[model samples]
Target: PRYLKGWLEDVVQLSLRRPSVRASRQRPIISLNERILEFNKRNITAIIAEYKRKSPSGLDVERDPIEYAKFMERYAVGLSILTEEKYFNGSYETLRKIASSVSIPILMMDFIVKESQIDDAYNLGADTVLLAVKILTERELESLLEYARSYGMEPLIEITDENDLDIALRIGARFIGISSQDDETLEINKENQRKLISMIPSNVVKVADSGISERNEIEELRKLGVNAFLIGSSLMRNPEKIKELIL
Candidate 1:
């Protein structure tokens, strides 16, 4: 009976975590696609500035979420919040807090494992959600994308290799991302990204994630069919670069 008591309590907590609802509060429609496309007119890569506490190597670049949220609104095309609690040390609370203060689209860039997380993203005020091909199954990715769209949340499909690219297209994902840092091998290769970016359709919104540090790199990526960029550690380390990167 003693052991069973602990087991039952665990089940209760898990169930409560699943169905718990937060009232959906969001602003008027701001098309993330249009945000990127508008930057294309300026011949610059759309910057999706990311908020993260630290890097994979444990470099602390923590910034005040609210202040950074406004910073992104002032300089970026979109804002991405990482809630992956391990290496990044992020949480859903931070995402919600930032989203509530910022007008720009909040791109939820977390490891979405279950369908329930999609609803959580919407209720938390995410305007778009990232569906990475590296971690999820085809069925999971397809269903999540459909669910996100069903809720009026844009889906940003992420890919690192040719096989991943095939999956993104097979499911007809228009906003495709080329992640230079392959999580599996942990290789940050701009050359490999160059090859992958060329293969992705020019018409679809092409987003470049990771391996970019300097403002000059944005121009170089824009030339390689990338319309958007997701910057993290580098930008967090030096927020002043926004003046140079955005202009």
Candidate 2:
């Protein structure tokens, strides 16, 4: 309904302006907390750091899951784990085991449709939880963010456009993920991304998600004020490139 959209918009705007939202209280092992702020201070390039076996897009990322974590740790890329059994291909235990081995802050990248997932994320040793703006109402989103904060889990809201950015701001989200690639077609929209990114707040640590393949594209996003780049398919397909680009 039209009313639902307006109500959600109001709630989102309010969440962004709240004063009580704070950084994760949990002490980071590999300085994930500091890295968030460091990105803002020095404009450092960071990665969302994902671990995937296969995607709905019909891509088999890594068959040997154990080796994936080791490679991420070796490259010093922050790891985001897929901790759900349904939808895409991943398991919570597999992610948890990988987290136990790595020192870097790991993000539980899942479609958090329920509050139970929040507890599951924390218990599984995730340093942060990803909340997608497109998949939730404003009330649910705010509640999830507050719940995540209480559990000592930092939240990175995945935003697709300006409306999502407004919601992220209202929820006091400091870390945000921007996806140029549309979920349906997996197509990247450079022109729309440029327009949307231009309006983002300078202080927010923006992470570019999807369709980033080349070093030049990474550099271009950096110029657009993106501090982090979430590259999964490209890196998973070419693991050796992780060492070269990171170095």
Candidate 3:
């Protein structure tokens, strides 16, 4: 408990040090507004893109960030980089380069238990950020989103089920990421995913995360009114599939 407290304090300090987190600069990216407008105008389906090295649940992904991103772009998916070393293995610099080269919007996929990481994401060129309610309190979530909005960085709050959805909405996050994977084990949760799909609000773009592999599932989810899908293990295994799905 003491160590956890110390770790949290470190995160708080990191959030405080970032200049972009200040209220003054929140909403700096006019381009992001245009992108969101265009996305809405074109009825574009959003993609929760991913980069990987390995997964705790028994998956080995490609570490070559550029090649992976290229394939993802071809598939018409927006990229999300896993910057933390603990779970979905990826580095910040690697993600930064990928973000610079790709035309698609980038979501920094990390366990954002700290505020400083949020600032680092914007500085590193992320178009969006992932916030998980499972790991944070309501106050912390709201504060982080406020800081993220200041930088014009959109927040896609990650939720597991309906209870998480309620928290995400209360925090005012429009874009939400729902994972089919169990957060603790990193294994798939098929039943919950199905239940979540039915419960999600129409106004919020319903993006599915994890356990997505087959095109048939995409078709099926699309029929369920799902707006986006975040695929990692499947895409990493078959990078060439990107062109077929994206175009």
Candidate 4:
């Protein structure tokens, strides 16, 4: 039976056309959440500020990616660059610009399903890559995890439910995220995130991603033992909030 096409499906298809090439690595690989934990040692909260021109939810950002990324590095523990061009309105050119300028860890955010995409990320200066469990088969997920690792880059596995969590854990995921939005429905449900946080093992670096907009919310999730927060839209709209969230 045919199903309704969603943004995820469209983006995955767009990814098939991404060019595959061997480009030289720009920086040494580093732990995805290293800076986050290091910064957290002094501050109560750590965040991975994300940069994207737009999202499937109709959220639009008009700021320059380089300027936004540099500003974020001053306070954020890491930077997440959305490299998908269609739905997110992001490009590898933007990632290259920020990578050449920022010293903080960079997580290449995209609907990544191929080794070529990972190659592009590594060559363009990504310190980490995102692997979404919902969009990949178990074998692909496992293979990409290793492929990203072979480059010495730490892969941050994104999980939306218990089954996703189980697959992530079984694959020896060192970093895990509980996102607030359902990628398919494109709805924000922070309550679901709150419940999912507890299920992540203490040994893994647990991060809360998306739909976070308030300082109090950060504090609440921090108390749940969340190591870091991956936030985009709110920060993209108001970079000044980075100061508020850090303290």
Candidate 5:
């Protein structure tokens, strides 16, 4: 498959080629960190359920993105919607529709390589945006993080390793995440993630992403001091399982 090799590059390339929409209207801001902290006060692992129509390398989620997002809003602290239309088969319209219909923070899950894309997310009603360190250079990542916050949207700076974590902290990231899955190889490495997440300071909002399945796994990570989680494929496979994890 063409996506098997250099799939990360493919997504970035597609994002660069896509038409950039300038932000139009004012989107009301919802604080992703505040919401997670609220759940933490209650001793609950704040879940930010994710919506993806299909993955370039993972399982194809079979559900209407908007409907699933709306459903997840009932159980999750927030929602992360894949808006990259090619490999993930997602659209900004889905983000717009769900953002209008739901009250929780909406994290626009896409390869954000440009500052213009943050404007697009701001225009689409997303309260947050994901900027992965694996895809952005130090300068680009810093620029995008500031750009997103300039629009009043918190950018979830995602890191994969200690080096990425260093960049995130150097850029003064307030909200940060570490995914167990490698973006380059699509392999899940929980131990590395554990080591990575532990390095994040207590003041910053620490989020764990990807490859979580069972409730026990979440509890275990919670014990390690993770405040939030962005779960996609496993929940997409069985939406009902969210009850177990949330409880």
Candidate 6:
């Protein structure tokens, strides 16, 4: 009785959180594997560059999707567009516009709760989809990865801490996303991310996500053998900061 109650509670919570969508539908695309290979060949840290209108903090580096895609095309490795229409005020239309405007692969950065969202990203011409390992069960994560691959979209799995990291590894994650911000508490912890880097193998394409504010942190991530980063909010504050970091 106790086990059934707990399982049903989990089901109820997931239904409450997972966004409902049915329909879904990308270009001759920059593949994530090749993208990583190119960045490695260049001997530079990759940037899964971000574009946003407003964040939870009301920070605005507001730009049209076209401009957002264009700017990142010139400077960073690839694009990360926040498409969570409520919290980040992101949209699939914006993601589609950005994808069509640029040849670079797009990371459809959103709180993806269903496989259909991943399929929509593919229809929108995105190359990768972010799967938050922190939220989904091992079965959900594993199932989502399979679905993403079947749709020809790469999975950029996001992990918050050691436990998340353990799941990522257990799933044989290739492109791992490590956030410096606490998932539930939402606190920025730079040193905590550094500790995460130490645990991952040197060969995995380790990416630092959110809470990345300083150039020194990027430099240090480089030192830790991290391959890429996904930046937000701050760069929106001073767009040129990202230009200087990459250029």
RMSD (Å) of each candidate, 1 decimal: 6.2, 7.2, 4.8, 2.2, 2.9, 4.3
Candidate 3: list runs displaced more than 4 Å: 1-46
Candidate 6 lDDT over residue span 34-95, tens digit each: 68668867876567778878655446555667866687687778888887765577887888
Worst 10 residues of 4 by lDDT: 1-10
Q: What are the TM-scores, per candidate, against the unseen true structure?
A: 0.86, 0.80, 0.80, 0.93, 0.93, 0.85
Candidate 2 CA-lDDT value: 0.68
How many steric overlaps are in each model, in order? 0, 5, 5, 0, 0, 2
Question: How do the residues 57-79 of candidate 5 rate in per-residue lDDT, one tens digit apiece?
Answer: 78776777667877887899999
Off by over 4 Å in 4: 1-4
Ranking by TM-score: 4, 5, 1, 6, 2, 3
Report the Cα lDDT for candidate 5.
Answer: 0.83
Candidate 6 residue 183 Cα shift, in angstroms, is 3.0
Quote model 6's TM-score: 0.85
Q: Which of candidates 1 and 6 is the stronger one according to TM-score?
A: 1
Candidate 5 deviation (Cα RMSD): 2.9
Better model by TM-score: candidate 2 vs candidate 5: 5
The top-ranked prediction according to lDDT is: 5
- Candidate ranking under lDDT, highest first, comes to 5, 4, 1, 6, 2, 3
For model 4, residues 43-80, the per-residue Cα lDDT tens digits are 75788889978887857878887778778878888899
| Steric clash pairs (candidate 3) | 26-150, 27-150, 49-80, 75-246, 76-246
Count of backbone collisions within predicted model 5: 0
Per-residue lDDT of model 1, residues 1-247, tens digit only: 0122332334323423544237576666466877899878976557888888964543787579898888778888898898665556777788888888988888887667567778777888778888877667788788888988888766999898888999998998889888877654455766678888888877789888884666688777788778888887767888777777767
The best candidate by TM-score is 4
